Design a protein around this ligand. Structure first.
Ligand code: ADP
Length: 301
């Protein structure tokens, strides 16, 4: 329909960021973690406020054909994210880089993720299973295996492991903490902590990134009802958060992208309800159920 000279791409004009804006109080909640087990310093509030401003700005770009692919949106999300990193940060590179096969893909379910232990144990789709470890030996774990449907191929995304033999673990740790030392232990425990999330294999990123581009293409249509629109946004958020494309910062980028797309359509999405951590809520569910409850995870609506 229209043509953007700057990027040399035709597009369909959309209603940029609405003029009605979230209350400055909610603006400072956008992109915040908000763990149910409890962190709102002037910094945390400024970080969120900034995410809010940049979200609407990228949404403005999208509505003008300035951003033309998901990959491009993810890039704007990454650059905003990197701007919040302290000068000379050694982690800077992890926040700017995509994840690969021989790299970190595990999140030990310790503080601040403690509240995930319950969600897994009580998960209607979790199944008892026996985990084999070179250290702890065999353990009884409640396991939730997140999967996705893609072109007829059902793939495994995130896997949650939660050891159930409490007493036995206390003793195993005590013994090991003396046979390997607090040091060697933490290293092995960085990848094999009884309670952990084994993230999506990086080998699936390419088809997932392509799928995210396909949802973006759909999401920027000018003839979508707000019901069809909200669904697409929830899906995009689901796939992005569950894929965890980058070595670091995926949840911020994922939420940023999802809200940038909504913002391009005028939708001013309020922050997530206290206790509702978007990426985790996504990793703990199937695509369809996540889309169904997306609205309820947000404040008003
Ligand atoms: N300074 C901060 N204040 C408030 N929330 C933050 C801050 N930094 C990051 N977050 C948020 O907390 C979550 C963790 O981000 P994520 O990128 O997945 O983490 P990491 O790669 O560091 O594990 C996201 O919801 C993110 O937007």
């Amino acid at each position: 329909t229209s043509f953007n000279e700057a990027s040399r791409t035709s597009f369909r004009a959309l209603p940029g960021p609405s003029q009605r804006q979230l209350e400055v109080y909610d603006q400072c909640l956008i992109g915040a973690a908000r763990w149910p087990d409890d962190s709102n310093t002037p910094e945390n509030r400024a970080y969120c406020q900034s995410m809010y401003n940049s979200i609407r700005s990228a949404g403005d770009e999208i509505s003008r054909g300035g951003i033309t692919s998901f990959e491009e949106l993810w890039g704007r999300a990454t650059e905003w994210r990197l701007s919040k990193l302290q000068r000379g940060e050694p982690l800077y590179s992890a926040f700017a880089s995509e994840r690969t096969s021989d790299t970190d893909a595990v999140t030990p379910l310790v503080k601040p993720y403690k509240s995930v232990l319950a969600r897994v144990v009580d998960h209607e789709d979790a199944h008892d299973e026996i985990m084999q470890d070179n250290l702890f030996g065999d353990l009884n774990v409640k396991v939730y295996r997140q999967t996705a449907y893609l072109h007829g191929n059902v793939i495994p995304l995130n896997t949650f492991r939660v050891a159930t033999d409490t007493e036995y673990l206390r003793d195993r740790v005590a013994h090991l903490r003396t046979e390997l030392g607090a040091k060697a232990l933490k290293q092995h425990l960085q990848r094999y902590n009884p309670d952990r999330i084994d993230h999506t294999n990086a080998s699936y990123l390419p088809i997932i990134k392509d799928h995210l581009n396909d949802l973006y293409r759909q999401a920027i249509s000018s003839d979508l009802s707000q019901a069809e629109l909200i669904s697409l946004i929830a899906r995009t958020h689901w796939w992005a958060a569950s894929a965890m494309p980058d070595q670091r910062g995926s949840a911020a980028k994922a939420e940023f992208a999802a809200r940038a797309i909504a913002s391009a359509h005028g939708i001013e999405l309020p922050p997530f309800r206290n206790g509702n951590v978007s990426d985790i809520e996504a990793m703990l569910s199937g695509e369809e159920e996540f889309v169904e409850k997306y609205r309820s995870l947000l404040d008003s609506d």
